[PDB]
Design an enzyme around this catalytic site. Structure first.
Site, mmCIF file in Angstrom:
data_model
loop_
_atom_site.group_PDB
_atom_site.id
_atom_site.type_symbol
_atom_site.label_atom_id
_atom_site.label_comp_id
_atom_site.label_asym_id
_atom_site.label_seq_id
_atom_site.Cartn_x
_atom_site.Cartn_y
_atom_site.Cartn_z
ATOM 1 C CB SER A 156 -0.860 -0.143 0.967
ATOM 2 O OG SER A 156 -1.914 0.670 0.566
ATOM 3 C CD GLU A 207 -5.861 -3.091 -4.209
ATOM 4 O OE1 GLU A 207 -5.406 -2.203 -3.540
ATOM 5 O OE2 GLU A 207 -5.285 -4.503 -4.255
ATOM 6 C CG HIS A 222 -5.572 -2.181 0.141
ATOM 7 N ND1 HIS A 222 -4.886 -1.655 -1.124
ATOM 8 C CD2 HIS A 222 -5.392 -1.630 1.318
ATOM 9 C CE1 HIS A 222 -3.859 -0.920 -0.544
ATOM 10 N NE2 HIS A 222 -4.210 -0.666 0.834
#
Ligand SMILES: [Cl-]
Ligand code: NA
Length: 297
Positions: free
Chosen positions: A144, A238, A268
């Site tokens: 991320s 996502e 995610h």
């Protein structure tokens, strides 16, 4: 179609998710993430160390090859997350890649806004090289916000004359601080994660007035020429889908050997759910194989 694990997982995540719009204070989010973090496997050994002024842990699963290491950059939107929140997943990546991982507690915003995190990442990489690890025996990975940081660290290291490692593996990378990609709309309904007007808040906190298109903050806008082989993981379900697709395009255009894998029905950083998600374990195994593949070349 979708495995029963992912289906039930999405169900559970939607149940526990905070209603859109509700503003959760930062310290509350930080403590919540720490509280629900998975405990690492009992065979993962860990060693506290300080690197470039940051707390860090060597995360070694059994089977680690001497001489090799992974610089790991955790997710958390540049405002939260820690060694503790990612120790479990990093332990499994270490297991699959047969290499110890350096899990960095880099500086977070808003207390330390951009480019604090990038400076720490680059310094940690320098630290590894200084410790004696060869560039060809190194790899950088992260999820991320951490995935974007992987790219930011590479570009910055390159610009400063540092050798590139053998590989880089961004997981569900957030490499565009503008958050304007279509997927924020086209993949919103299928993304059980939160949510975000919440993500714009993190960008605001990290940038603190900086250009959202700054190369070190949003690598999708950077010159990626000379970067090492890339493995990009991203779930089809996502909001950050487009970040990975555009990153892959940017890389190939810049001559980088890039390999994008869009996992169907995944969310995610689905890797983080390896304890109950077969695809999670599978994706982590793949990250490890790719790292080993690149080190073998
Ligand atoms: Cl920072
Ligand atoms: Na190919």
């Amino acid at each position: 179609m979708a495995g029963p694990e992912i289906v039930k997982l999405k169900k559970i995540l939607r149940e526990k998710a905070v209603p859109p719009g509700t503003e959760v204070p930062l310290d509350v989010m930080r403590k919540g993430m720490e509280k629900v973090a998975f405990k690492a496997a009992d065979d993962i050994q860990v060693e506290q160390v300080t690197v470039a002024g940051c707390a860090a842990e060597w995360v070694r699963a059994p089977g680690c090859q001497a001489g090799k290491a992974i610089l790991y950059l955790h997710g958390g939107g540049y405002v939260m997350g820690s060694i503790n929140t990612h120790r479990s997943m990093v332990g499994e990546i270490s297991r699959a890649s047969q290499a110890a991982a350096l899990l960095l507690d880099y500086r977070l915003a808003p207390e330390h806004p951009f480019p604090a995190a990038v400076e720490d990442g680059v310094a940690a990489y320098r630290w590894l090289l200084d410790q004696g690890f060869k560039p060809q025996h190194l790899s950088i990975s992260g999820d991320s916000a951490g995935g974007g940081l992987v790219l930011a660290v590479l570009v910055s290291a390159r610009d400063q004359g540092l050798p590139m490692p053998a590989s880089a593996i961004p997981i569900s990378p957030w490499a565009d601080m503008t958050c304007t990609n279509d997927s924020f709309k086209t993949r919103a309904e299928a993304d059980p994660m939160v949510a975000p007007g919440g993500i714009n808040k993190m960008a605001a906190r990290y940038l603190n007035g900086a250009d959202a298109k700054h190369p070190y903050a949003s690598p999708n806008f950077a010159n990626l020429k000379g970067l090492p082989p890339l493995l990009i993981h991203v779930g089809r379900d996502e909001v950050l889908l487009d970040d990975s697709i555009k990153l892959d395009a940017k890389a190939k255009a810049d001559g980088v050997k890039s390999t994008l894998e869009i996992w169907d029905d995944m969310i995610h950083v689905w890797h983080a759910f390896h304890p109950m998600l077969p695809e999670g374990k599978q994706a982590i195994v793949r990250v490890g194989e790719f790292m080993r593949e690149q080190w073998a070349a």
